[model samples]
Target: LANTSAHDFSYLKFVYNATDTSLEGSYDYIVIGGGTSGCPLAATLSEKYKVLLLERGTIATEYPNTLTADGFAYNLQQQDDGKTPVERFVSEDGIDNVRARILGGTTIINAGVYARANISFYSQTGIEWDLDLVNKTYEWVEDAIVVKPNNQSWQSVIGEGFLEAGILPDNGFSLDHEAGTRLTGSTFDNNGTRHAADELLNKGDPNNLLVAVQASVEKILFSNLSAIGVIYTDSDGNSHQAFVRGNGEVIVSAGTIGTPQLLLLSGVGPESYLSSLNITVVQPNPYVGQFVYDNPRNFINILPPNPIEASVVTVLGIRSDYYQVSASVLPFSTPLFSLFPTTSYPLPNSTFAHIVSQVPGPLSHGSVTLNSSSDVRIAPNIKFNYYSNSTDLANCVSGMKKLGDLLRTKALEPYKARDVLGIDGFNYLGVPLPDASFETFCLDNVASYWHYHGGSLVGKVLDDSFRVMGIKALRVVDASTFPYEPNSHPQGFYLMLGRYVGLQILQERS
Candidate 1:
């Protein structure tokens, strides 16, 4: 079913056929994964070259539930075995998490919070990114999708607590990553509508861009260690091959998990793992699926004293020598509360708010390994060692203590309520626990912030320009290329990254 909107996107044409159609095209650029980064990158490249953009999931515009701001949890907490656009999985640590398989990728299902990267994040990477150009890239992307969140009822009360907590001088309503209490930008507009990252593709020259949904890329085609094209499967299991012409490139922006899985399946990862599965080696890259990271988080559930209500963004940031602490508000009414029954302590049904702390710089890294060679349909083995390091544990414990202090502050006296964890007699991995047992408690209930990085880390597997270290004509431009997880949300950094790579490609071509 092909549907074109006559209102806003009248100039655009989207090919919705993903079944039993043999695609035959030789373009200047073939981009796999029409996701957060892929969409903008393809759109940028299409300004000068013929670009073929392939996505494994349905169009984001078609999913109305995912397009609404409050419907985020609905997409996030969809049944794991169901046919939703989100894929739910259990990590090696037994924690449940979800990844987006949709065209807009995780951005469509996220909390809609938007934040810029810390200045220190760029300086520490050891890669020389022209700061001026990077800032310009941010402006372009932000102008397209970023929005200011409105102050709602419960969040207003939480903001007063943040001011009283004395983290820093009051800094209000800005997206800059400053060390203070400020209302951050969100992809959600003031009207409660969500503007997804994929919408940035609309800025491209539509005459030169072609987007194909449900086009799942199986493996990258290589000749003498040089990427030439790709062989993909449509929705109906129909195989199709597409290649690039002179000076053409194959850009892999299939996200962190998908990128490494495809690389391993195509014989570009560790030799031992490849040999164990009888897969022929192509690049023998030892670090293809290593050094992956996820933000391990824990929540403190608080039931408001009364039935006072309103939905809003209530988040505070604190930076210490050991970790970056972010306290965000989550209402129990959200679908996320139901997704992980074990993460939070159950309380008497009432209007509830959760102050969740996220440790973004966990020393522990994870891995994504191929499960079998015959099936790309099967997700690879994921082991995110949440709280694997003692330092990470200590940092998280400190964060918990700080949140406990905030609840006791006089500013929050009126809204003060009992902790569900204490009332419910919770245990850490079956061991009865307390704040002193934070280390053990964290081990049992640690979960993901849905932000994943690495598995194709720059300076190890790829270079500053995002080209794979030992390969040619191929580049990776998603969270998979991040050397370390940013102290805040990664969507903003990724948006800049897509444009950065696109600009690099254009400069090189020129």
Candidate 2:
């Protein structure tokens, strides 16, 4: 209390001093993995209790490169930049996926937008929890983060091409589903404001939230029958343990990959899997390593008309075929599309009018489990097994074909090229031989949009409330808890889960 004053902007410089120090004792609550939901949960928990948020990485604002969308896009290559130690894994078919170990979890450099989960899935899953209960959490999340995305951008460009090609119906798209067009809802405040959890939870006291850079959570700390805290190593090569006292709950908010790995490390997964590594099992759950799911996101690039060659275009409407994936009740032949070209007819970035359609259906399912006892490392076996199912593959094939057809309409047909490279610049290689087989084309070129879900899921890892069975005070609240791949963008749902968890924690504590 000796020092207290109204601080000015320049006088308020603060760096996280928790990095070099150890938080050896836990408090009333311990929230792990600061991400889409962790931050909100931690913020709310701290309101009534001495909550300590143990983050594996630093705050998002500390990184200047994360300030803009394009800047963040450019840094995607930096994972291979060799600055941090990253784990690389190959799918059954040999596709590789990399996850960033930075703070704000993935959202720091992620495309900062918020989209809700399908309203129908919660009810459809037949889970004990009601859909409205979870949706109410979404409302809280949307309100807290201000989920207003820039409605007109690249989506308009793609939408116009789909409309001229008769692919998308005109009035079907809304604020939530911005697929087949430039996406509009983002976690970003276009007016240059910070909405990431780091900004939200730390509005008044920015320094209390401890984010350890280059520090990876190695294992969960547990005692007799409850989760106590965690063990982690920092950039300086020093290991530290933070213990939890009574009433301190270890909440695992790690995303799809991180959360499951943490559980297996503490002997909560399959008993045989852990015994193989000479580790003693405390509890066994067969479903812990099973029930994984994620969608295969295919991006379709289109060329712009000569007259509209100067401006960027965007589309935000859903498509008729999207309903075939159970995204909507509309028929496959419905005619509705939301088109957005630059208000100006011709602009230089006109080629930007590419439609991004996320098929609502998931044909492939994948799972993650421990190949070893190492918490910082483990095997991630993914079987996007994409298009393995004929129905799933057909939907994707049809979606792509529909997009291609729309872009080559008679009005834009003159722009179509027999030598495909003459038409699209986004793909450095020209159509990879148009005669190439469709299955081969998608397998080799298209990839997941880095969206993965359904690991240690609800009913699989934990119940609807995220309380892992038989565990005293441990729970999981992240995208990994999703039972199936969401029909649309999952960022909104991830946060919704966080809010829901926070409410539960608060209610229980009360």
Candidate 3:
């Protein structure tokens, strides 16, 4: 076996660290955040225009494990010393959550599952679409990084469970966002090497792309209600300014949370809210942080009959509007059972199976506000208000019914431990399996699938071209503009959206 090496440093020629020296630049585009959307957008724009891509985190090369498929869970589980790539935060809903703070954004730490947006997403989403270009862009990204995964025993067992549960005609391996059980693409290759959006920047013209890490944009420098540039700080806390020169634009692809948070910090929100935070209101807009939503995930832990190979989400079972299902075999801590052997789950330190489902594009939504206008590092006070809608509650119950069905499947027999409780075929662990009153149980045990979107909606905050309303040379190209979260994991479409819109911007300017 060969030792794993560092990521290719070819792009390093144009890479710069946010230095204490306080540099300044003027580029055709100043793309905020080097993430799933940001990287692709920056890379695409750099094809013909100068792009400054700033990420307020360290480089991925600094964290080697993040470049491997095996590190998908490991990276997220690491204890955050406030300097790690994965940053931990608690929502106002009290759900524990984490955000990516690395150069590749969440792609490096994510499950690596690559499922495109639903077909209806383009036609229904408020943004105007170029269907032909969209298809080409998807093909472009797939060719560069996406891979067909070799399903292990764990994934196959879970897929069998999906079939047994009546998820319908198997679509086998595909990425068309269909309504049946299917295997999807992953960012990880056969050798388990993880390819992230950051690498896509290598496709960019190196001379036109400049990447800066640990550079946090403090505020959008504006004049006459138009974005002229940005004021940001370096890792050394030295302030730097980046301006969009003639015929240039500033795009904020800082993700759902960071995008909205940055808008408020730039003084682009409601009068009353901005007044409270003492943020100077640049333009009165009521739709900046409204309608924030997160896909509420429900799951049951199963004590495997025996230790199995650990797996992430490799297959998906989608049944239209009801829910999307996937499973994971995670490494459960062995000592958790020793702590409460008699009264609790008493699960041995082994690979634990988690049958999980998330209510797709949750209708019920909430809003996010600044906890401190000064510190963008602090997570905003957020409330998804899960299951607030009656339909969402019903969908939650229906998804749980699917989980129950899968859990009871005969194909899952090999994974279940000896049922000592006489609870029938499936041996449930971690939280009691709900016997009834599914609605209340759903509300009480609500969790996040980590697919959150919509703080700056398209029609409300941004125009058809993704440019901000009442603001010139300013646009938001991340999931923040999503009318609803995509049915599948949102990253694949994110990678595409970045490139698609980047091409659109270039075309408009030309």
In terms of TM-score, the best-performing candidate is: 3
The TM-score values for the models, in the order shown, are: 0.90, 0.78, 0.93
lDDT of 2 by residue, 1-510 (tens): 001111112202432334566455656666777776776777667656666666665544445565554344334434344233223445564455555554556655555556666555667666665466677766665555544444442344444555666654564334354334334356656443435554436432343444444555778777757887788776565777776566658788777777877787778888777788776777788766565655655544344343233221113435533421101011112111111111112222333233444555565676676656764644545555655666656666666666555555443444443535333522311133232365565555555555677667777668766888888888888777765555455676676667667767777777
Model 2 bad stretches (over 4 Å): 1-22, 79-92, 128-136, 147-153, 164-173, 178-183, 191-195, 203-214, 302-314, 317-355, 375-383, 409-437
Query: How should the candidates be ordered by TM-score, best one leading?
Result: 3, 1, 2
**Positional deviation of 107 in candidate 2, in angstroms?**
1.6
Model 1 residue 418 CA deviation (Å) reads: 7.4
| Structure candidate 1, residue pairs in collision | none
For model 1 the local lDDT of residue 313 reads 53
Better of 1 and 3 by lDDT: 3
Name the top lDDT candidate.
3
On residues 1-510, what C-alpha lDDT tens digit does candidate 3 reach at each position? Answer: 112233455777778888844347788999999999999999999999988998999888888889887776666557777668888766777776767898878887887888888888887875678988988998888877788887777788888888899998799998878787888888887678888888878888988898988988878889756899988888777888989998899999888889999999999988899998788899889999998988888777777766777775678888865555554555545321111212233443556677777787789898989988897777788888887788888888888878778877777776656644333555566664562578877887777787889999898898889989999999998888875766668788999999999999999999
Residue 255 lDDT (model 2): 76
lDDT (Cα, tens digit) per residue for candidate 1, span 1-510: 001211123323654555635455688898888777887898899899888888787766566678776677667655655346788777776777777777777777777777788878888898888899888888887777776666766666666666676656567877777777777777777767777667877877877887777788889889746888888887778888888888889999898888999899888889998999998988898899898888776666555566556464535555542222332234444355324534454433555555666775767888999876856768888887877777778878876666665666665566545444332322112222255588766776676767878899898789888898778888998898875666567788888788788988999999
Rank candidates by lDDT, best first. Answer: 3, 1, 2
Candidate 3, superposed: residue stretches over 4 Å from native: 1-9, 20-23, 330-348, 419-423
Q: Candidate 3 vs. truth: CA RMSD?
A: 3.7
